[PDB]
Amino acid sequence: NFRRFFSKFNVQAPAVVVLGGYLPIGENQGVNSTWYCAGQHPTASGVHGIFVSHIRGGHGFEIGISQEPFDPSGYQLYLHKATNGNTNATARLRICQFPSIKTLGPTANNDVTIGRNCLFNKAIPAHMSEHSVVGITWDNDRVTVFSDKIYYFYFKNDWSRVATKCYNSGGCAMQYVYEPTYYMLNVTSAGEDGISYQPCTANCIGYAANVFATEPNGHIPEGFSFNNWFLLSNDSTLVHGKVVSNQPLLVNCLLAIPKIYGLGQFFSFNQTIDGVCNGAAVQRAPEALRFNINDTSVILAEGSIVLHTALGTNFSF
């Protein structure tokens, strides 16, 4: 079940990463409250993530997501999926402020705040399997779709009320999740099957926030926060804006949670750095080295940092 759910995402063979999110637990594991919005300690916020792959009629899937606090100047979403087959599973997805009503149809006054044309209007193919669900989750400005490939999109608004013009399904037919659970995902089999999807207990946030997969092209996988990543600037400061520039972001190798540097580990700009290059491997001599920080006390206590010049002069931190 979960094997097919997470096998769709593509990644290099030697990978182990902690993943957090509203993962499914039961077909109809009922909610513990009757709330659809999110606030302090937001757990029973309704359906943070819904996942459905079954239907009792088979005619199709109509989905409408909005926010009950009624901010009509925002955006709405409809999904019209033709429940026929796999290529026919292509669903018309429309992210636009919709001329909709709180009632799921034209039977009252309409919300017409649709000044903007649209934010998205395309048809996305899907597929059918018993253990391949299609669903949607939202988390802050993050929107993630389990349908074929993950679909992640960024926008600033609130979405709190979910409904469907097609309710011809049982409670177990759709899985609604509301609590972001954490699981460490390990894959090294070089196949659709990962090593495990074991739940994560500790260091999950750090591991998730720092561990990623090195691409064959050395590019950045999406969704990464870059929480401790900052623009390389020799001066000045920019709160906001956009720019193109040269930055030390290409990668030759990747390491995480080191355990050997305490034994006088040495690194050079010539040699490609050895170790578990988490993700792909690049046979390119390093040009710079980036370091994550958790507790400087180790550095303060026994961090022995000494640098060497082309004339042999050294400087010890």
Binding site: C96, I114, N117, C118
Partner: protein, 248 residues
């Protein structure tokens, strides 16, 4: 005066309102050039878009020039002021003040140039409302073009005013027989007076039924004529149909 024909045009107006209302939002759904040419919302939104982008300009570059240091140690006058004696900095500040003043003279000239041209343009649009709206134009296509005007709903938009020309549209064409003129007793030439109207004969003499009416050339409103509606001439040409006094 059937009272229905204007009703028939009414749902045409209402159906047109629906498309116009529809076309206001999401122009790029199934747009066509025939629906994107002149007198189209797309052309209209093109105009509104370019003008709003146009007005959203001509100020940033001003910040750009003042940012620069031109042929001087530093853009901070006080720095050199604190870091140097008087005379050399005086040379550079003269350069600097000359640079800023020259840039803004070019700027103020071009801005007033827009001002002059828009004064003329603003004048022109002023008439447009007067005639087309405040009054009824007899021009063929002056308000917009190639149509017969009915009225126009005039509205506004940020810092401007807009026209929507409600215009009648021809769809059918009545094919009728025209008469050159009348002569009677080879003495009296019965002839037209007002060029807009025209005499004619619906149907022909196939079964002794020649329906002599008069109507406007432009519009099809057949009706029986009157003698006083015509004029008399003392000269005749072959173009006139021959009639007798009994036929008068």
């Amino acid at each position: 005066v059937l009272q229905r024909n204007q009703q028939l045009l009414a749902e045409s107006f209402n159906s047109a309102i629906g498309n116009i209302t529809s076309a206001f939002e999401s122009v790029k759904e199934a747009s066509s050039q025939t629906s994107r040419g002149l007198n189209t919302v797309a052309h209209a939104l093109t105009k509104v878009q370019e003008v709003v982008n146009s007005q959203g300009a001509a100020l940033t570059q001003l910040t750009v020039q003042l940012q620069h240091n031109f042929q001087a140690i530093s853009s901070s006058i006080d720095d050199i002021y604190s870091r140097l004696d008087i005379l050399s900095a005086d040379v550079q500040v003269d350069r600097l003040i000359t640079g800023r003043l020259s840039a803004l003279n070019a700027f103020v000239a071009q801005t007033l140039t827009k001002y002059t041209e828009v004064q003329a343009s603003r004048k022109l649009a002023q008439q447009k409302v007067n005639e087309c709206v405040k009054s009824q134009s007899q021009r063929y296509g002056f308000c917009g073009g190639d149509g017969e005007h009915i009225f126009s709903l005039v509205q506004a938009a940020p810092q401007g005013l807009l026209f929507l020309h409600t215009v009648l549209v021809p769809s059918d064409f009545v094919d009728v027989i025209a008469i050159a003129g009348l002569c009677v007793n080879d003495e009296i030439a019965l002839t037209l007076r007002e060029p807009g109207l025209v005499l004619f004969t619906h149907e022909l003499q196939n079964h002794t039924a020649t329906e002599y009416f008069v109507s406007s050339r432009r519009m099809f409103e057949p009706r029986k004529p009157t003698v006083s509606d015509f004029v008399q001439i003392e000269s005749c040409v072959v173009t006139y149909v021959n009639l007798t006094r009994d036929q008068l």
